[PDB]
Design a protein around this ligand. Structure first.
Ligand SMILES: [Fe+3]
Length: 281
């Protein structure tokens, strides 16, 4: 019933993973190589480079800039801010509010990878446009998306993946997203923040890797990969579009816990995203 119980005991447990990581057999029809599929299964993430042209990247950058500079045009429920100061930090449900980001989510070069890896038709569980500025950028502490999606949102199986489309450069120096490769095969229960000893254990066994890339690079990770990021004192901002794909067969149920606002998760009984091909501009 609850295959992945968390926030119930007082102590923390490392339970095994009971879902595949790659939900499809590999063949020459797959949108990715055999080695990339194997890397995903083993590490829980992979990095796609050079899949969008220079113009498409400039287009997506240009577009994100406009969204971020124009909060009057959008649903106030979806905005996240520097409190106080009036600075836009995130925008949820951009895939619904932005015809450009809607088209991004549906691009084959992303959606076909997700349908393969998730071995199913897919829909967006959540989307974000994110801007971490220079000088004053916060850390996001270590967490597993799935642990929250399960407990708070009712996502029942590890059958989803996040896609982070970089829009500003990630150097090693400006708090790029950091992962613990392999951590996706352990479900770490929370007493919802993971605990120091477990975290240390994972990082000692597996190490840390913080993949970088020029704008337009795409970082894909399993829903249960343990990840996070340092702050950023540099003048160089971080900005990405964050897209979470879920298998349609893995639709949300009632939360495995006590309750979460609509813009954080499509609770609905949703339908398959329709893949679009050819360039963006
Ligand atoms: Fe996250």
């Amino acid at each position: 019933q609850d295959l992945y119980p968390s926030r119930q005991r007082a102590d923390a447990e490392m339970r095994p993973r009971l879902d595949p990581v790659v939900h499809s057999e590999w063949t020459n029809d797959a949108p990715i190589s055999a080695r990339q599929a194997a890397a995903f299964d083993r590490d829980g993430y992979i990095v796609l480079e050079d899949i969008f042209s220079a113009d498409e990247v400039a287009f997506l950058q240009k577009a994100a800039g406009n969204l971020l500079a124009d909060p009057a045009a959008l649903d106030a429920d979806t905005i996240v801010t520097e409190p106080q100061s009036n600075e836009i930090r995130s925008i949820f449900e951009i895939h619904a509010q932005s015809p450009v980001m809607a088209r991004l989510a549906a691009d084959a070069r992303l959606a076909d990878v997700a349908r393969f890896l998730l071995g199913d038709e897919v829909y967006i569980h959540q989307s974000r446009l994110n801007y971490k500025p220079g000088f004053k950028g916060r850390e996001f502490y270590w967490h597993s998306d799935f642990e929250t999606w399960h407990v708070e949102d009712g996502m029942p199986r590890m059958r989803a993946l996040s896609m982070s489309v970089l829009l500003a450069e990630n150097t090693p120096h400006n708090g790029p997203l950091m992962v613990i490769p392999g951590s996706h095969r352990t479900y770490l229960t929370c007493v919802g923040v993971p605990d120091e000893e477990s975290l240390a254990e994972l990082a000692h066994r597996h190490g840390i890797v913080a993949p970088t890339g020029k704008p337009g690079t795409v970082i894909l990770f399993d829903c249960n990969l343990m990840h996070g990021s340092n702050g950023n004192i540099t003048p160089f901002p971080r900005a990405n579009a964050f897209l979470v794909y879920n298998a349609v067969s893995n639709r949300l149920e009632k939360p495995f816990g006590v309750e979460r606002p609509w813009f954080l998760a499509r609770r609905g009984e949703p339908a398959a995203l329709r893949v679009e091909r050819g360039p963006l501009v």
